[PDB]
Amino acid sequence: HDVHIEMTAQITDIEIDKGKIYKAWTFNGQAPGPLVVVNEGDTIHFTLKNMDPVVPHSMDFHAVHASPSKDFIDVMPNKSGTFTYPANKPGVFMYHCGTKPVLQHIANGMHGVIIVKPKNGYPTDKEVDREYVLIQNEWYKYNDMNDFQNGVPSYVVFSSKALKPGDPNTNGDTFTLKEKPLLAKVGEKIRLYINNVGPNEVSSFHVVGTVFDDVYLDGNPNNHLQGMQTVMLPASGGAVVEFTVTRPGTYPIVTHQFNHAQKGAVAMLKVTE
Amino acid sequence: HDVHIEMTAQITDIEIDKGKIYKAWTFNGQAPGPLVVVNEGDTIHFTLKNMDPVVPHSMDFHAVHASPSKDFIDVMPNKSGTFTYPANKPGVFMYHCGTKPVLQHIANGMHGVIIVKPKNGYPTDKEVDREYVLIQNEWYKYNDMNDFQNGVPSYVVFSSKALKPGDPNTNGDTFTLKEKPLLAKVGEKIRLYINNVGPNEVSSFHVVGTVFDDVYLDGNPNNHLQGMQTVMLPASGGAVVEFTVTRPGTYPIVTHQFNHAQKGAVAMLKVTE
Amino acid sequence: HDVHIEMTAQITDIEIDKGKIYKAWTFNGQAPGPLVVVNEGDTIHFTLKNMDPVVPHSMDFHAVHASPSKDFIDVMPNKSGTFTYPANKPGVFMYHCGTKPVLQHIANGMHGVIIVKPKNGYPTDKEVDREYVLIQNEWYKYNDMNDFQNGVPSYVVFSSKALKPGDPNTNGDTFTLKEKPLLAKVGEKIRLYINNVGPNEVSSFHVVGTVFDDVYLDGNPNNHLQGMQTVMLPASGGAVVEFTVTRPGTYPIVTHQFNHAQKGAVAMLKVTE
Ligand SMILES: [Cu+2]
Ligand SMILES: [Cu+2]
Ligand SMILES: [Cu+2]
Ligand SMILES: [Cu+2]
Ligand SMILES: [Cu+2]
Ligand SMILES: [Cu+2]
């Protein structure tokens, strides 16, 4: 129940659209950052190693109870910081750099998801056959604060982060989850752990060709909805969603705010017999 | 049991604002399209007859479980296509054309609502005196993909679709439901089946002069809220909302995102003794 | 109980950003307006005295059942009007000027919150140690209808309104709740009564360093969520949110739509031993 987690902050080139490279600010060389998974009640001992020689970075986990001005503080270039705090609430939480201006650090790529598994799981656990994590984020004009604050996103994208060995692990880009769809089998109930990290947009989350059997808002098992076509996610908003795929084919996964879908936010689930 | 539905795709001029005609892409000569009502558990046998001589069109019902790559496929100009799928979930679901670019087809007018009536209705059925269906959509600069992707809506609008003969059946425009308000009587509980089809905006749905006694998110009877002033609808989001009108007068119906209201999204409800 | 409330409509200079003065349209010389607090079941006898010499004004309370065309009607310059209506529903409700164009009156500053206390309070009343009221609003280019309808907000801001002597009572501005943080003590469970009055944006409401233990949507005790990281508020949407601060320090309060936080929407909560 004491968990020890280490990440680096670094600058990494990410191909966010075909032929379009963004010099992203990242945790562990991915944007969004690596998945973190803990159990409800765990105490996290988190170390951030700042490998950006130019600017400070920090870590804010939405899962934890912490003092932001003591526990989410900036770690200087080529220094490390270690912070300890509990994850007392089950669900699907955003994490991100909390260095001012926070919009600048998030928009440049410093966001991710931490999942906190509920003590007694979900009441539909037994029904689920397969699970994946999906994250939505936006990309803007490169490190352009005016665009971050006042412009529309250049791209809106999905990525998937591995829950277990063999799961895809991808970055937020307009194509990878079209070219290499997530995989499932006919008749399966799929669970997706989803978070919209923004920075700026809300998400109207919809899987084409199915209906969500069960939805747990922010992944807290108490927040139970049934039979939703589309799940409204605020910026930083999470959910656990579950649905059945009844026939073979490819099922798009979108935000239904179609300007964002048009700008990259469509992932594919390939369902085979 | 088995329901057979035939609709056409065609181009239809729609006066979306006073003296402003939009050459809309439509189902059945209306934008949004005609209301479709079925019962929970029905199998739908849907035929789309494409009467557009230039562009393919298709049909995605949010109500159904289907293989999108087999059952939501394009129907070529001057052809028909028939697809069969179940509607196993109660609620107020969006439908729309699913032809790429989907944003273009939705924005041009190819959207609508299908209601799936719950097996046992709603726990508040006995309390309801009167019902209407309202849909919110946006209009952009005519068939302008840059405007669709990056621009603000030119108009945001409500329409009503007839559940009963002599309910109003209108298109998405800025003026019809102001000039010809919906009708009700003092003391009645009113139910609205509502959906925000977008394409791009979320909706903050509010009836002036009342509070929603009961709300069922996406029209599923299990998703029950009470005493809401305003209902957040994602793009494609639906609800069943119920409220009492206590006094004679005219009650505006709005999205409380007032930029949208100002750009046309105000309908009126005239309540008389 | 019969409650008698009076406010004046007037023009008031407000420093919405450091060194930036907005000639606001206001209730009682504040924007947002003064807090109103009543009990569920109260009959409100409200008088508006319009001291604007040129423009009519009005009052629409989301809390009440009323005829908008009789009870929310315009009051002419230098005149008064008195209107009587019940507040039958518990929660945190927006109020605002209902004079056309409503977008202009809201955007210029004529918005506020009325709290309706539930007849039997909230099931978590016993756990709550301290309470505050926070309101989110936007500001645009001064009285510029094109910007109101089509532009991004220039500032997005929080204000606090007083429940008791010593509670901050502030205007919507970019700085006051940063310079003068809300106060709390380590270990306290804090209740916030919150409303996003818009006019145009939704809000992704989040307290940094904590998780909401309980959330009551629109402040109705029945609309109960648990363990939310972030609360989605439509334009005009309210909530009662409760959270624990476990450690000393300063905790930012944000909308997590970070373009808006960047443009002013960050308040501070300073937690001491
Ligand atoms: Cu950073
Ligand atoms: Cu955050
Ligand atoms: Cu089409
Ligand atoms: Cu759809
Ligand atoms: Cu006014
Ligand atoms: Cu209002």
mmCIF file of C-alpha atoms and ligand atoms in Angstrom, chain C residues 9 25-27 48 50 52 55-58 74 96-102 104-106 110, ligand 5:
data_model
loop_
_atom_site.group_PDB
_atom_site.id
_atom_site.type_symbol
_atom_site.label_atom_id
_atom_site.label_comp_id
_atom_site.label_asym_id
_atom_site.label_seq_id
_atom_site.Cartn_x
_atom_site.Cartn_y
_atom_site.Cartn_z
ATOM 1 C CA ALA C 9 -30.548 48.624 -11.119
ATOM 2 C CA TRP C 25 -24.818 47.366 -15.525
ATOM 3 C CA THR C 26 -25.610 46.118 -12.044
ATOM 4 C CA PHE C 27 -27.989 45.178 -9.329
ATOM 5 C CA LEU C 48 -36.841 46.388 -8.514
ATOM 6 C CA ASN C 50 -34.578 51.065 -11.906
ATOM 7 C CA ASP C 52 -30.793 53.656 -15.053
ATOM 8 C CA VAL C 55 -32.456 51.626 -20.341
ATOM 9 C CA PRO C 56 -35.257 49.443 -18.866
ATOM 10 C CA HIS C 57 -34.293 46.497 -16.583
ATOM 11 C CA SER C 58 -36.000 43.463 -15.071
ATOM 12 C CA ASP C 74 -39.314 45.403 -17.793
ATOM 13 C CA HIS C 96 -30.350 37.966 -13.960
ATOM 14 C CA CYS C 97 -31.892 40.844 -15.851
ATOM 15 C CA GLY C 98 -34.491 39.538 -18.366
ATOM 16 C CA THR C 99 -34.571 42.640 -20.603
ATOM 17 C CA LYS C 100 -34.020 42.164 -24.371
ATOM 18 C CA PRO C 101 -31.421 41.624 -25.629
ATOM 19 C CA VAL C 102 -30.809 39.456 -22.542
ATOM 20 C CA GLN C 104 -26.429 42.378 -23.470
ATOM 21 C CA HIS C 105 -27.839 42.782 -19.958
ATOM 22 C CA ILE C 106 -26.158 39.654 -18.619
ATOM 23 C CA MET C 110 -26.702 41.913 -14.493
HETATM 24 CU CU CU D 5 -30.986 45.002 -17.491
#
